[PDB]
């Protein structure tokens, strides 16, 4: 039976008549997508709903990607009626509405629970943006026990300037007592922190004015971070600074030295986290000695990292590379290169190609069992999603997809990215794979699609084909229709105005910019594009594809003052994460896609190695 009850329910339903869903219910219970339903025709008379009913339905439907936004206002209902007892049996903190914290530190005030229900209220207090309604009623009932000090409306305008909510810290600058003036103070030196260099202005010494004056010189280490030191130089000892902000202070400022390649960072980073506790710092301190040449601290370094550190591919990467870099005829780093031989990721390759030997390269899909496979495709939400996806509802059939991954162990996860994979759906096979952590299976981990406009575009603009396979690899992972939140779309992600632009310098037609989500419309511009970056920087890929992510002037900014700088230290002194991961991604696919194509590619070409400013 080909069931159709449903797309006439839907209709109904979809506004205002829940006569025909009515009607179905008994017909439709073995459809899969009749829970959708159902939820609708809940949702719009739930405030007559009895407790069973919803209960009911939460009971049985638990599984729908949108429960939660039943539950939030079914229990915003409850705690309007003083269902407390209904309410908690029901809230769940793992729903991250802050709402229903709110709701929960309430019923904790008012049950016997006031300790609790202080610390929910603080908690949710310390928060530097603006609070929901409900969270208002809370602090209202905690200031009304005597609870909200005015140290408390200090600490919350503190995280209101650091995030940048003036209206809220003012509206809290306000509310002080007796620190009113400093209060105005902190938000005017939020806003702009180069006012700190009127240091005859901030020398109150009092806890009030450092703290004013440590929001301000963490601020001022963005973008200014020589005139943040000079002015901590100063201010170090005229204010009362804790030990706890002078830390703070000190590791930001370090931090943005460092991605600046400035050699003050290091004793500042060595003197403020001695035992390697901020890993982002031992990190930066360690890229900042490679960005030196500074091998031997390097090395040295590298041998006191933190277990998590140590583990990782990269630092056993830079251990056996600043080694070798410290001692070039020792003959240590070969044991350690080959413990990262094996590795399937861009600091594996780098550890191959420094031996010179082969790259590991095992395409090997993972056996299922049947009865895990069975258990997956039987799930209510893979049917669900089979169902959305057969009737066009893409959407949908993702969010079904995505939230049923939430919960599935590793195994299950594979067998889901096998169903995705036989759907040409290689994003989501994409997704489940690696949350899996299955990297050895390269034909789901690197689709195909599109293969041969791809080789001849690349061919057109003297482009390796590996490259921009590599490229929409990383940009879209082959979904067409991909969209970014600031408008990015397609296979390459190209901009709107990016696209018309290129457009216009290759004669290349293009309607407009929905054609964009045309695969060969993408791929003929993407490629044009590719190739404009490709020439800007040489032809070198390393700089290309940093500059199609992060654009060409930060690439050049990047560049400056570099003289026979080796590709990895490059890479790896990247100040963006973002950024450096990227670059890393595009190269090691580019070598995937190279064996696929019988096209080898090394991690770099040999005009690559070294580069200049």
Known sequence: EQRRLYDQAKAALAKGNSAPYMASRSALRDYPLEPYLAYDELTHRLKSASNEEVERFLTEHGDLPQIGWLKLRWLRLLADRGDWKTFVNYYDPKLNFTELDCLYGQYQLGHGQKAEGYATSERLWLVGKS??????????????????????????????????????ASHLAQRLPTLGNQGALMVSVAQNPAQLSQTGRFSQRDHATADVVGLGLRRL?????????????????????????????????????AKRFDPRALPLMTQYDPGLRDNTVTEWRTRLLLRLGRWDEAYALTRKLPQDLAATSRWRYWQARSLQLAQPNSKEPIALY???????????????????????????PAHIDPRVLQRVRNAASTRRAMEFFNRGEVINARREWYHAARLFDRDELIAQARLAYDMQWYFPAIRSISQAQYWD??????????????????????????????????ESAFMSDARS??????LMQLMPGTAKETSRKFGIPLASTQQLIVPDVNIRLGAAYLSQVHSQFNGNRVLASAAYNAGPGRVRQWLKDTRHLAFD?????????????????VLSYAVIYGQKLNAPQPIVDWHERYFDD
């Open 131 to 168: 609070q929901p309604a409900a969270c208002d009623t809370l602090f209202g009932l905690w200031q009304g026990e005597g609870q909200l000090t005015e140290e408390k409306v200090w600490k919350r305008l503190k995280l209101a300037a650091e995030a940048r909510n003036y209206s809220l």
């Open 221 to 257: 280490a963005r973008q200014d971070p020589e005139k943040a030191l000079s002015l901590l130089d100063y201010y170090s000892s005229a204010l009362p600074f804790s030990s706890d902000e002078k830390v703070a202070i000190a590791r930001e400022i370090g931090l943005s030295l």
């Open 338 to 364: 080959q413990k990262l031989a094996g590795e399937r990721d861009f600091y594996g390759f780098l550890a191959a190609d420094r031996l010179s030997v082969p790259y590991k390269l095992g395409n090997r």
């Open 441 to 474: 299976d390269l034909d789901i981990r690197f689709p195909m699609a599109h293969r041969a406009t791809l080789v001849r575009e690349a061919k057109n603009r003297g482009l390796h084909s590996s490259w921009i396979f590599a490229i929409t690899r990383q």
């Open 485 to 490: 939140g600031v408008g990015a779309t397609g």
């Open 569 to 585: 230290v490059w890479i790896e002194t990247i100040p963006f994460d973002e950024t450096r991961q990227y670059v890393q991604n």
